[PDB]
Amino acid sequence: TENILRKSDEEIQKEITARVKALESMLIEQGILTTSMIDRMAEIYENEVGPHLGAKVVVKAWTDPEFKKRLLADGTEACKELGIGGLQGEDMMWVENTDEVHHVVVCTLCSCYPWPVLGLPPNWFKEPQYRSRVVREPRQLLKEEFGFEVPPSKEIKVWDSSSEMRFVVLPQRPAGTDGWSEEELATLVTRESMIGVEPAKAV
Amino acid sequence: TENILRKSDEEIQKEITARVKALESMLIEQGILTTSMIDRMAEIYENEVGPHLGAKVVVKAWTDPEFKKRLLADGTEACKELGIGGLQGEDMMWVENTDEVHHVVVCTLCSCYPWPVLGLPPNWFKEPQYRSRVVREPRQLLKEEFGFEVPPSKEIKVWDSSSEMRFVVLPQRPAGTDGWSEEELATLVTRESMIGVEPAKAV
Amino acid sequence: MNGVYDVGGTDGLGPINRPADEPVFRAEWEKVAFAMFPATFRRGLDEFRFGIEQMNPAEYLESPYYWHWIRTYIHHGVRTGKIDLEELERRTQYYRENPDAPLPEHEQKPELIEFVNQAVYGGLPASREVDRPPKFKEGDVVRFSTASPKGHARRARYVRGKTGTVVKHHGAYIYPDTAGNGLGECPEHLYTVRFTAQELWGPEGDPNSSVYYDCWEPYIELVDT
Amino acid sequence: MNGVYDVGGTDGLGPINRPADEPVFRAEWEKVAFAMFPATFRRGLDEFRFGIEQMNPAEYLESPYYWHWIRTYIHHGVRTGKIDLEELERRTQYYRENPDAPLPEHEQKPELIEFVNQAVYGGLPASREVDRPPKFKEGDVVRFSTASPKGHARRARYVRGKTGTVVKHHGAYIYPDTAGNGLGECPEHLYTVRFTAQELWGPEGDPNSSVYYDCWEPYIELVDT
Ligand SMILES: [Co+2]
Ligand SMILES: [Co+2]
């Protein structure tokens, strides 16, 4: 939004870069940061951990009703059955989209997100526009920002992660996918479908 | 406070000046602003209306107990007895400092101030630091910002002007001023003493 | 609306910046912004507030105060179509580049001066006479509404749902929840209510302090007379 | 604390800015800020949050997200004296002027890599075993405290004093009101509570919506089982 007091993006980027390199040079001299530790972290959430992991959990719960029941009883344990877990997903509770109930997830206090199944959150999730409005106008927010009309009779449940418990949406299986393979069904599970801001892809 | 995104004060001033002259040139062409109307307003609150007016009300209530009772019953009517009133002081309620009670005044929603007795408010009154903290830590705010220790047994009453009613503090008469003239006592009444952030001057 | 502008009880805004003295007007542009308050209501005061409340909050929190007045005027201008926003940008750049360029030629208007002196010394009273008598009276114990309108209102978040004691009935006044939203005056009875610090903040409140907050009749409901 | 960072239910922040795609890291500096989360707790996660919450709000609301992490690290560094603030300013200007200058020579450390892989795939669980049993159970109707600590807590203003229904007991976890204020873990039982939109916002709330908010035991008191 327009703010006449604000520097240009380019000027902001240039100032942040210098402040960060300066702090980094001090942490390195203290021995608590190294270039290799930085690259390993970047490498992990750029290539290893990401929403493709959460899609596997979704297609398994879609095609395996016993697993789905365990997913909904205890999300951390069930995702572990697929070797999926760890940092910022130590406590995971998955919640099921139905014909009667739609779920959407948010961290109004900061940016809490289930990193082991989704990776790091997109910037709109961590920013004040989504966080402030979704607990208060979920139905319009979904219509206006995501093109997603949730009928006024359907209940919208908003999960605000004020604790280390992380909420992940299990989206409804799209119609027209009977008997599809797990890899086929995965192409329909989006990051957005597991935040609850979109359904899984149609067709 | 430090904000790395913020332009320099000089750059902010230069940008505001241009935006204001631009808006002004448009309002003038619409005929709703003129240079003479601007100068008259500036002239009034630079030279005519100011806290010297409120000091007269204070010294009268100090030296006239019947007037003081009318001041506290209906502030607008009593100030009118001195030909003092008008814009942003249509409804005035004055409140009395005692040995048991100290009063402080604030507009947390914006900047409401009793213009006819005080003039326009200082910038710290209209800014978020004072407005946010005074309803919540009045005692420390008075100590830290104004050097004013209000003993923890004394009750601090904070008046938040959420309506057109304007609150004005009647400060306690300083000790050691028995029989002083009205002009002498006026030198002790400050703008700050009628906001409640300071007592009237000592000695 | 639940704007950040509603700063009562917000933590972490920092120490007060108070110079020892300052002038009424720190720059000539501030006089122009000021003169626009009286030029505005000549939309009322409530709508004028609502437009400041819809500012960019980061802009609101750090800009010079009278910039808020410039913003609220532009807000209503473009909405009522009286200010063409594109012409205004062109004029801004023009004056960016030629800051000493003259203003447009205009006739001085005597009636604008008489209006100014009239409003300043005569006032613009918001008190109104209504047909219903007051619902509440001194010493009634009342509860501030937990409603949260999306438009303009005077319901500071830090009192919503709190319980206080009615301290004074003032008569009836312009009602902000209609006036500042373009829905008319719809006058309502006005009361000062007293809230203890401990009711407002919990144990973190000063044990010997209270806050007086003005409530319009629809804001409060009886708990005990 | 009552920081502006607690944005749930705030009005007027504007439309969402969402590009169609974006990379995980938009600039190399963001990777450096990110790597500082794991370098921090090697102070816990709660204290890390508290330092972001004490930022300048206008800075907080508009800066790139990972700038918040840089701020919270500097906050704790100067406080614990581990970051000399004057050296840091000199280094900033140095890198302002020589942005391609090398970093200081250092030994790579194998144990920092093993720590990283350990934290990432093994996790850093906040669940703890406590000696007292839970006070509350599914279907209990509870009221969220109206307390307002000045330090760190997880009491979003928009639920304080609201009434909800306990939905699930999770066990006990690190308690933020002690942990994020340097007062230890002091583990407490954790519950998900359900609040209707209408309890939260009044008539302005969606008539078919509810918000689930996690509450630690001291946050809530019984109204009805
Ligand atoms: Co978060
Ligand atoms: Co005000």
Residue numbers in the entry:
A (entry chain A), B (entry chain A): 2 to 204
C (entry chain B), D (entry chain B): 1 to 42, 46 to 228
Excerpt from the paper describing this PDB structure:
Nitrile hydratase (NHase, EC 4.2.1.84), comprising α- and β-subunits, is a metalloenzyme that catalyzes nitriles into amides. The NHase active site contains either a non-heme iron or non-corrin cobalt, buried in a deep internal pocket, similar to most enzymes in nature. Hence nitrile substrates should pass through a tunnel to access the active site, and rational tunnel engineering might be a plausible choice for NHase substrate scope modification. We rationally refined the tunnel entrance region of NHase from Pseudonocardia thermophila JCM 3095 (PtNHase), based on substrate access tunnel calculations.
Two successful mutants, PtNHase-βM46R and PtNHase-βA129R, which exhibited high catalytic activity toward bulky substrates were obtained. To understand the mechanism underlying the expanded substrate scope with bulky amino acid substituents, the crystal structures of PtNHase-βM46R and PtNHase-βA129R were obtained and analyzed. Both structures had clear electron density at the mutated sites. The βArg46 and βArg129 residues were located at the “upper entrance loop” and “lower entrance loop” of the substrate access tunnel, respectively. The hydrophobic side chain of βMet46 in WT was buried and oriented towards the interior of the protein, whereas the bulky side chain of βArg46 in PtNHase-βM46R formed a hydrogen bond with a water molecule, showing an obvious outward offset to the solvent. Compared with the WT, an additional potential tunnel that started from the active site and ended at the surface entrance of the PtNHase-βM46R mutant was observed, which might provide more alternatives for bulky substrate migration. Introducing β46R and β129R mutations into PtNHase resulted in an 8.2-fold and 4.2-fold increase in activity toward pentanenitrile, and a 6.2-fold and 8.3-fold increase in activity toward cinnamonitrile, respectively. The residual activities of the WT and PtNHase-βM46R were 64.3% and 62.0%, respectively, indicating that the mutation at the βMet46 site did not significantly affect its thermostability. The maximum entrance sizes of WT, PtNHase-βM46R, and PtNHase-βA129R were estimated to be 39 Å2, 47 Å2, and 46 Å2, respectively.
